[PDB]
């Protein structure tokens, strides 16, 4: 049987209307069969909670346990609120082939039709897939994979609110079967040039959310706490209020990174659009998401400020 | 034929001065008897509460007259969805006010400006229109203002209604409605803007890990009225910045809950207990709407039960 | 300056035109390859045949096997783009790209989705990244991997999408960027090789629902039909009368294929039907029609069931 050692960081899968790793596979025992199970509590945290201190300690602890000749896999046992930023996280730092899956569960294990008992067999099965090998970083949530550079969060409180909204799902788990049909083209895990091992805090990334009548203010409050980055979440493809752009450029021109993304939910936010990125000093983060670009631009910001540079990560990752 | 007036602000739409717009799609003008006024020529982007008054203000002006069937408004497609949800709450009239852009520029391939206007135009005239509130024409589609988002940053079919679907269809100028919005808008609406110069401020917040309380600090600072928090899955904040909106809150400055992942409802009752930090719960909306609706409340109150129940209503 | 053949068979894109009257309203092709033109058919794509299919394949064969001829474009019609493309995607024997296109609104038409869709068609054929993705319908600035792609609306110009999967990609005003590519095998890597079948084996789709029949079972049967695809209720289920006449088909040697009429998601083993128990393969992650060319292209080297289920569970 497999090795595969569960890291439960908390979220609503180990919630009760907080249950340990042993009881959450004692509500799914038929798992056993699967693998021989190790559990192991990393944090006990609503994911709404979560920070760069813990991020770290879950990827140098995943990139341990898969360095380890007899361990298979890792399960993340996770909040659904931000298992879309944790999971792109550790695919750009996770030094390895073997399978890592995120998994949660949007009502608690107390719940009428409780979603985390066969999310959680699911996930297993995944890990265990030898198909899931050099696939990423996967979420495995209502019998979907998804690569974690595509997927997030789109509804409030849906058990289907996973999608991958630009690629779409790259596999598929009914009842533990497991069956891929795309994998992701660009880089992740052992391919990445990312490598968190002598970091112990993330360079601070601060999110704008773009309106009309928009301010500076708020530019301006994140340069003062020291923003290395900041992501603004334009109106449409990444644009901006003019007084906002202005208040980015000058903290473009003081060497804190701007990077454009979207409040609309999918699609790439474009270079050559209607921003002049390179007269004005930002980064287009073309197809990502707001809260995944952040994560991309603190890993980028561990290695470089350069525009240039910082561009060509975006236009790689 | 019916009267429509086309009230132009700019937008990829007219990436082009009214009459040019018009004339590029002759056969609207079979339709009805077309008048087009320049209102503003700005990029989406750039809208303000000003020119969303002076916008307000001018529909009202139009629809009130007796030989108006219509208002078109052509507009870039970024905030197309705060324009209209605006005008949904503040035109004091069932009569058709239709928004529509393009994704693409009339001097593009394929540009979707002319089937969108031509579009537009019949859905204006359409009898079934009436009383269906303010409505955003899109790509073969009709969205009520309440529920239409651009979804995608390019796509010609970037607009969406997530929580619902559209509320009809139109095919080469076929209109056809299949639903209505049951939330009361236009003529049912409480609010009315017609003695507002000025709109209170309003900030939004975009949630993430390891969040920050400087930027509701920033807000407070700035004279924000209200603030919108767009939160982690169902609207939960970072414990700092909970902290920071509970301090807002006991400042009088009202705390509506919204979410950043793009659908369903910003609950009451869920992991936030609202009623205990003073905050909002926004329901079925999203941030940028979110903000409009809290806008306008903030003109006749502050008061947090009755801007929940606005929430619960609109 | 890369070598592109566009092969014409009709559609709306062509709502009639000649090629290079199509390809004269999007001069800005030509700065980005030599383009030659070729007129296969000249039929809305409600009348392909299986005919047309082997002579597409067979000259897209021929053109790939060329060493000056970068890639290939096929204009055609919407309606069944999505056999066209899976079909070629398992009887290409090249890595060069494939590409076809279409348009939902004719030339004539305001907004005319043509120009640009074929615009971004060219730009896909000639993108370095393009080589090995298999066939791809290229359609409002989306790649679609031909095994993942179908026409899911009447009318809408995004009426293409790939509901188990999604796009593998996309080009905006000629910019191609992929993020995914198929893991199941097509055109270099395919069992199949058409070059020398003349007319592909007859197989028939039945649309199921309540309080269903056997007539069109038995009709399917007696017009000589090879293969059967059932387009199920839910999980690929029959009403019973239905399922009794398949199982007769079956025990004839007629393949059943169950797949589903719900749109998405997989038609699978060991749900509800005893599909070894009663001779059927199960289609999987397809949709009826792509099943029915998979079917089509299964049966032109065996009927064997097991052999058949393997082919599904492959490509
Ligand atoms: N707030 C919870 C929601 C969930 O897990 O569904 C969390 O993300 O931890
Ligand atoms: N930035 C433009 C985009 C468009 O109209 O499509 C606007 O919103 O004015
Ligand atoms: N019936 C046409 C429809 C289209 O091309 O859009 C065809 O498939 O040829
Ligand atoms: N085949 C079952 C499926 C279900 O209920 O999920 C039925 O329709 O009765």
Redesign the pocket.
């Known amino acids: 049987k497999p090795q595969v050692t569960i890291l439960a960081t908390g979220g609503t899968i180990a919630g009760s209307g907080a249950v340990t790793v042993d009881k959450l596979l004692a509500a799914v025992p038929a798992i056993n069969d699967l693998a021989t199970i190790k559990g192991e509590q990393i944090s006990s945290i609503g994911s709404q909670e979560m920070t760069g201190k813990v991020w770290l300690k879950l990827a140098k602890r995943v990139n341990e346990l898969l360095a380890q000749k007899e361990t298979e896999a890792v399960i993340i046992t996770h909040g659904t609120d931000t298992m879309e930023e944790t999971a792109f996280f550790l695919n750009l730092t996770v030094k390895s082939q073997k399978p890592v899956v995120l998994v949660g569960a949007m009502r608690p294990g107390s719940s009428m039709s409780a979603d985390g008992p066969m999310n959680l067999y699911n996930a297993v099965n995944v890990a265990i897939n030898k198909a899931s090998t050099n696939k990423g970083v996967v979420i495995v949530m209502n019998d979907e994979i998804h690569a974690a550079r595509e997927a997030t969060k789109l509804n409030t409180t849906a058990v289907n609110a996973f999608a991958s909204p630009n690629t779409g799902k790259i596999g598929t788990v009914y009842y533990g079967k497991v069956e891929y049909f795309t994998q992701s083209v660009r880089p992740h895990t052992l391919a990445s040039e990312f490598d968190i091992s002598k970091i112990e805090e993330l360079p601070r990334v601060d999110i704008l959310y773009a309106h009309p009548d928009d301010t500076d203010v708020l530019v301006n409050a994140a340069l003062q706490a020291g923003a290395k980055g900041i992501i603004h979440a334009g109106?449409?493809?990444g644009?901006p209020f003019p007084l906002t752009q202005n208040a980015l450029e000058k903290a473009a021109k003081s060497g804190v990174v701007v990077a454009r993304s979207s409040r609309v939910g999918s699609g790439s936010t474009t270079q050559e659009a209607?921003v002049d990125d390179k007269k004005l000093g930002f980064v287009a983060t073309e197809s990502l998401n707001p809260q995944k670009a952040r994560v991309l631009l603190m890993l980028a910001l561990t290695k470089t400020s350069d525009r240039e540079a910082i561009q060509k990560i975006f236009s790689t990752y």
């Open positions: 109106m449409g493809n644009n209607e």
